[PDB]
Design a protein around this nucleic acid. Structure first.
Ligand SMILES: CN[C@@H]1[C@@H](O)[C@@H](O[C@@H]2[C@@H](O)[C@H](O[C@H]3O[C@H]([C@@H](C)O)[C@@H](O)[C@H](O)[C@H]3N)[C@@H](N)C[C@H]2N)OC[C@]1(C)O
Ligand SMILES: CN[C@@H]1[C@@H](O)[C@@H](O[C@@H]2[C@@H](O)[C@H](O[C@H]3O[C@H]([C@@H](C)O)[C@@H](O)[C@H](O)[C@H]3N)[C@@H](N)C[C@H]2N)OC[C@]1(C)O
Lengths: 203, 178, 260
RNA sequence: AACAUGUUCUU
RNA sequence: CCCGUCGCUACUACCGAUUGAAUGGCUUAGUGAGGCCUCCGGAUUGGUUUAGGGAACCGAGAAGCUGGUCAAACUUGGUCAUUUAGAGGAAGUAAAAGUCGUAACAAGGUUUCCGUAGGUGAACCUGCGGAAGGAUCAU
RNA sequence: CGGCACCUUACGAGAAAUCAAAGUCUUUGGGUUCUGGGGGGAGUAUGGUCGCAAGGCUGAAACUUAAAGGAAUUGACGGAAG
RNA sequence: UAUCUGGUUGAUCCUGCCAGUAGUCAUAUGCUUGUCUCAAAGAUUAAGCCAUGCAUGUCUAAGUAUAAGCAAUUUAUACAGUGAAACUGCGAAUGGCUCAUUAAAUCAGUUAUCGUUUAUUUGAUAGUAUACUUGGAUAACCGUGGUAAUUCUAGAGCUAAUACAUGCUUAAAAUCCCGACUGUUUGGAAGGGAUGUAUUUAUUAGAUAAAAAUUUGAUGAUUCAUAAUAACUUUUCGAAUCGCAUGGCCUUGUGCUGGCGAUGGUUCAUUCAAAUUUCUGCCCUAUCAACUUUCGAUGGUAGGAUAGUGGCCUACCAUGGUUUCAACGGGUAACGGGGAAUAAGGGUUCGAUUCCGGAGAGGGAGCCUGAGAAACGGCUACCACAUCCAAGGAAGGCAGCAGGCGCGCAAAUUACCCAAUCCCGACACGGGGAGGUAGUGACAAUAAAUAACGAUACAGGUUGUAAUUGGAAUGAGUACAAUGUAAAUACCUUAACGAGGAACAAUUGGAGGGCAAGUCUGGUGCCAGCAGCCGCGGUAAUUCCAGCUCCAAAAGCGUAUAUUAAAGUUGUUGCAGUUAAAAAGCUCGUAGUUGAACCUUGGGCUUGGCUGGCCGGUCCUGGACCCAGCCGAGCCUUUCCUUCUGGCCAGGACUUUUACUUUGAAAAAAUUAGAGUGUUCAAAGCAGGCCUUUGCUCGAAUAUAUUAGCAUGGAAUAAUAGAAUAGGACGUUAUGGUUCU
RNA sequence: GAUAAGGGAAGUCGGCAAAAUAGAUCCGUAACUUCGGGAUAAGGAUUGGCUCUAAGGAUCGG
């Protein structure tokens, strides 16, 4: 089938090599998963040594990390907005490693509000102001108020990340390999990398 | 499969087939030791030749040399033991003087002839072949069987020989009765 | 070649087994086990070609099927068990004990030992590192693993192990002045004492040694088996010769002298 | 001035 | 002593119309078995298990279907290599005593030879320049 | 000092003729390029290449054969000389 | 044994080849062939085609037994013994065969995995926050069958597990997050969660340059090991299994308990493997000089795929990569190597083939299973062959063993057996054409019969004598018996036999030279024939055809082809080039090869060893002293010979690069050289020898390997670098300034 | 002026007449040669619609 041998290629001098042996099973390849966004379907692959791989054919949700805050939650993936290696993966929403994706920003919002007491979005419309007034006037016992005070000072976050919380979708980078592990995991874009990808996107 | 068995040859024919001098000398040796053919002369030439190649190389080395001393002394002792060399000639330089007339003395054909067991050396050969000879307590039927000094004393008629005590043989058992 | 070889040709068997050429096509193939294939002596060789306790391999099978034969005290029935360096072989039915030790000529001599002696062995430290749950262990040259060793032990060190509980009795630090015994190379079977060690980063470290008779001989570090703490005191019994090489003329002189 | 040629094979 | 043409015979190789022939390899293009992956499908089957008659909704799932992927093989064309038929043509070699002359070896009866160019049954002859390996180491 | 040569010798070289190099080479090594490997077939055939052409350069094989060849010696012969 | 001889001429000296000569574990062939030990054997042409039979199976007390199988009544009315079938597990990826493909490929030595997978083995190693033990399938089996036919199977009825899927039995204290109330300058607290180990991602430990105003592993080196936090997962597994003994405790309940074990299980280690991988090294060819890059060629970034690295593949981008130091292309009557033949030395030639590595199973490709195969005594498909058929269909792969056809110069029996060697399996027991034993076997190798001894008159100068007179001896072979052996055979041992023409009858080539041995007789008459070469033969042939004699080797001798020496006729050692073959018509010129001399030489002092003699001291050998000789060290001479710390070793800071040579580590057996051994000798083998034992015993040496790589001493020879617009060297504890840690 | 099963020049003096080919892009292209050619040699592949992506500019303002 698909093969990874180096014998079928030309030498560095440019000579066309002669056939040495028939194809060997220890040098096979297989078909790309071409993971998509949809209801979960994961197929096992029996590999060498009796080990197992997982071809994520379709995935709904991934475990994403807010690196600075030291917390990660099992959000859900909206779409693919940028791929460094091929615009055909973004145009068809194909999930591989290093794909720039938008995830649901909601669970990180809940964690922010529960572990701090402040809110994000910062937009001053009707629903945004209503939710802000609700959050600022929540019911907090004195010990939880003091532990949140011990969590104060560093409450504010970088202006680029929280600005996007108006839309309920953040920007992330896939760090797992869905075709190899069956997981579609990543981390929130932050700082210099975030500015780079925003520059690439808005353009 | 199973490992090969090592083997070799024990003679080498001369490069010149028709040399009158060499041919005459070989016939003289054959007559003086009652040999079957020239290959027996060839075998002595061959073995003495490899002895002299090794021993020449040793003599080309220095004394006290472990290669030299060890191999030369081993060769000297293996030569003295068989009766090719004598008692006063353990030097490694007398071996070069050795001659095909030497190695041919030690054969059981010659030894049986020399100590009265046979009327002629041809008789000695036909006695050894016809199994009437004994070396110590081992009966020997090979004419080229080399006798050391230890078995020089121990050559006699076979313990069960017609000539060494026992039923005589067919011609006797068919003629004496009548 | 599609998979693991299960036969060993006779000519491909290690020479230090002294296997005669013309017996047959094949040789015992030592099983996977504690020692390397090449640097071990399978039990069938030990119990047939050395002790002559058996006329053939079928009788070797019969002998070991009756719980007679033991390695490191434990009972083994694998006819091709890779017994190796420092292994202790117990034979209670015969009331006899052995220890595989390199005679100076380069082989495994038939080294008889006592029952009190046949209850321990020695082990070189391959490496020291932390396992799961942070528990430290050291790996020995016989595939034994021991947890919780002395926090000072490092690689190239010899440890004493009891053959019953698998516990470590006492050990040795690797430094200049230690009695050792070469594990490979041309200097096989000979017993020396450390003189100096030269450290080549990225390469193979070199160690300088000296026999009881004054002879300086160098060897790869990976062939050095510490056997004692000082000169003259091994932690096991030594074969007939005490591991000192004698030249061929010397041995010939001794043979003539002994025989008269 | 002219002047071409000499069967085969040896002892 | 000896040269070439010519005559009889035998053997070897070469050129040669036949867009000759045959065999083996590589290859464009066209078609393409089959497996594997994927996609739906849903003969059949047990119930995530529950319903007065059983109505939902769980699981397992064969044939087949979609799209890929690896790609045998066939046709066509191309190219490479190796054998090989062939009217006729032009050589070479061999083979006691065939024909024609006598070119060379003597100043070989025109000294011989080299390069080049013409001519001629054949050896060869002639022109121009060269060599002595000359028939002159010299006036 | 450089050059074109010559005469004698032969230590030396060589099969000899001869050679001041053709010496300093079995007592075999200063540096370096090119060429040959019995006689023919044959500098032919074929492919390539240069040339207007004539040709030049590169360049086989099958097959055939016991010599061909070099230098000198004695004779013989010469439309050679004395 | 470092060797030559015949042939050009009337004669000579040369060049030069032809011929002769000897070897070949090198093949065929002719003739001949008594004995023993050892032994290759359808590679060469056709990796051509194959009838038939066999070559892979496997059960212990410890997985599953209502054989309606066998035995008997027994510590067993759930079974318990033996033992078919079948399920389950394991093996079938080893072995054996072959050499077609293959020329930086394979392979060899040498590396790397801080770049991966690994059944098994052996070590370890998990108390994780209905349980007197859960379900439902099917085989085996009885029963109806269908097809011409295959190791084809369908309906129906049972029934099991270490098969399949499910599921609890549980410690101890402790940490963390959330936290209704509550104390009140910041405490307590009810109640909820996570605790293991696997999986994925992200983020933090993983430190160790020396004094002022705390614990921490390894490496040459890491993002290593290990640990923590937050989360994640079509939830991995933290035992619903089995045999024999049945003990101890009573709070006497079919009570609580507990001995050797079988099997299994996560992770790590190890072992057996694998897959990649560094450096150097291959035969002929230019009538192959440019090659590679469309469609990956060289590289970069990102991904996908893999067990994992990597253009392995994709997307975008850059325009690179190899080459006269021979790339690329073509040939190979090319698998590589260990090795083999010949060998003064240097070389030449060969290696299908007993060991190692690779590759293949008619050709191609694609897969399943499994730890491991791109497996062919596995599947699928095509091509080519090919079997059966009732014409609808079915079944194949001898380059396994033996055997057939074909091919050719060219190669053996359809035999016996697991007894040795080892391999596999659940296994002490089963299986093994692997392997071992016989048949065929002048491939090669070792030893070695075809005769001998006496007497008459003879013959002769003390025996060496030409014939025929006798007594004996013997194994070639046939055969009582044992041995040998799995059973045999054969050898070895041995009753009765077994020689005068001992007819129990030796052959193959020769007799001009080279080259050893005739000018004897007939035949022919340049014919027939011989002759490697020169030649013989035309009516007196030492050469043909024949008879006699002789020569050489002999159980072996001759022929053909190839190759080695001879060949200094391939020449590095080591050829030749005026005329024998052969200096380019002549200069220029790049690659290549090769290139003048020169830089620490001398001198002195102290001292180790081993060489000869003087002491001589002699038991071959022994000590201080003198003499000299060789191999060495250390100091001093303007003085090289790294440099600090602790304080002659052991941790830091720096080093101009090479060639060459020394020494060493390591380098598979077999083969080679070589030490020990009455295999009766020997070739061989690695054994064997001892007062005769209930034991004792030396062994299974040693060198050779080294082009490349690694470590190491030396500094001649031959290179390389340096300070010239000074951008140079030193300032140790020079001085000042700017940065870091 | 058209079309025609199967065959495909057997028709005819003769393929007369008709048919077949045809634009463009990419690939590939022999002998021979006056070196200019031969050449569109020969012989292959692609081509619609729609929705997108990329490249190639001008003028002002330090
Ligand atoms: C018409 N010209 C011719 C030319 O063609 C050639 O002639 C050859 C001639 O040499 C050949 O001759 C060849 O063969 C013959 C044959 C008897 O063996 C012999 O003479 C000789 O071996 C050889 N030369 C001949 N066979 C053909 C002619 N055309 O040479 C001679 C010539 C006269 O110039
Ligand atoms: C010397 N030149 C000669 C020329 O003279 C000629 O010679 C022939 C020669 O060939 C003839 O000879 C030839 O032919 C005869 C026979 C077939 O006739 C053969 O037996 C003989 O072997 C063969 N050489 C000979 N018989 C006469 C000469 N003149 O042959 C041609 C030639 C070679 O050019």
């Amino acid at each position: 089938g698909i093969s990874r041998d180096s014998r079928h290629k030309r030498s560095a001098t440019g000579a066309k090599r002669a056939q040495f042996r028939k194809k060997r099973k220890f040098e096979l390849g297989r078909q790309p998963a071409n993971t998509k966004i949809g209801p979960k379907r994961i197929h096992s692959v029996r590999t060498r040594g009796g080990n197992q791989k997982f071809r994520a054919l379709r995935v709904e949700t991934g475990n994403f990390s807010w690196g600075s805050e030291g917390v990660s939650r099992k959000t859900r993936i909206a779409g693919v907005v940028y791929h460094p290696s091929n615009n055909e993966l973004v145009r068809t929403n194909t999930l591989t490693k290093s794909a720039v994706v938008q995830i649901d920003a909601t669970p990180f919002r809940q964690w922010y509000e529960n572990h701090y007491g402040a809110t994000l979005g910062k937009k001053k419309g009707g629903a945004h102001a209503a939710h802000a007034a609700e959050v600022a006037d929540a019911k907090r016992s004195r010990k939880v108020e003091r532990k949140l005070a011990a969590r104060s000072g560093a409450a504010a976050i970088e202006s680029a990340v929280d600005s996007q919380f108006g839309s309920g979708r953040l920007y992330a980078v896939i760090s797992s390999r869905p075709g190899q592990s069956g997981r579609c995991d990543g981390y929130i874009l932050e700082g210099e990398e975030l500015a780079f990808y925003l520059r690439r996107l808005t353009a | 499969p199973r490992a090969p068995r090592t083997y070799s040859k024990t003679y080498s024919v001369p490069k010149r087939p028709y040399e009158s001098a060499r041919l005459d000398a070989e016939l003289k040796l054959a007559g003086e030791y009652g040999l079957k053919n020239k290959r027996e002369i060839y075998r002595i030439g061959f073995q003495l030749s490899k002895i002299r190649r090794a021993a020449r190389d040793l003599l080309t080395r220095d004394e006290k040399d472990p290669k030299r001393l060890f191999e030369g002394n081993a060769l000297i002792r293996r030569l003295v033991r068989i009766g090719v060399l004598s008692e006063d000639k353990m030097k490694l330089d007398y071996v070069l003087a050795l001659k095909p007339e030497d190695f041919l003395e030690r054969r059981l054909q010659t030894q049986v002839f020399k100590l009265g067991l046979a009327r002629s050396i041809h008789h000695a050969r036909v006695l050894i072949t016809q199994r009437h000879i004994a070396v110590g307590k081992q009966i020997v039927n090979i004419p080229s069987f080399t006798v050391r000094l230890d078995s020089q004393k121990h050559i006699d008629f076979a313990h069960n020989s017609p000539y060494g005590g026992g039923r005589a043989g067919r011609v006797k058992r068919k003629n004496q009765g009548k | 070649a599609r998979g693991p070889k299960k036969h060993l040709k006779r000519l491909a068997a290690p020479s230090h087994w002294m296997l005669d050429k013309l017996s047959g096509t094949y040789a015992p193939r030592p099983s996977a086990g504690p020692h390397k294939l090449r640097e071990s002596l399978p039990l069938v060789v030990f119990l047939r070609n050395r002790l002559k306790y058996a006329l053939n391999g079928r009788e070797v099978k019969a002998i070991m099927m009756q719980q007679h034969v033991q390695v490191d005290g434990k009972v083994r029935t694998d006819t091709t068990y890779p017994a190796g360096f420092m292994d202790v072989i117990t034979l209670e039915a015969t009331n006899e004990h052995f220890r595989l030790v390199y005679d100076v000529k380069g082989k495994f001599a038939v080294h008889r030992i006592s029952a009190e002696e046949a209850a321990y062995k020695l082990g070189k430290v391959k490496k020291v590192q932390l396992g799961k749950k942070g528990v430290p262990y050291v790996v020995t040259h016989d595939g034994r693993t021991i947890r919780y060793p002395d926090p000072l032990i490092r690689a190239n060190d010899t440890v004493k192990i009891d053959l019953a509980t698998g516990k470590i009795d006492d050990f040795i630090k690797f430094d200049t002045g230690r009695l050792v015994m070469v594990t490979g190379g041309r200097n096989l079977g000979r017993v020396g004492v450390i003189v100096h060690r030269e450290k080549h980063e990225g390469g193979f470290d070199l160690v300088h040694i000296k026999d009881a008779l004054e002879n300086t001989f160098v060897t790869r570090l990976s062939n050095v088996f510490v056997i004692g703490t000082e000169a003259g005191k091994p932690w096991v019994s030594l074969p007939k010769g005490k591991g000192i090489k004698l030249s061929i003329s010397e041995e010939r002189d001794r043979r003539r002298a002994q025989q008269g």
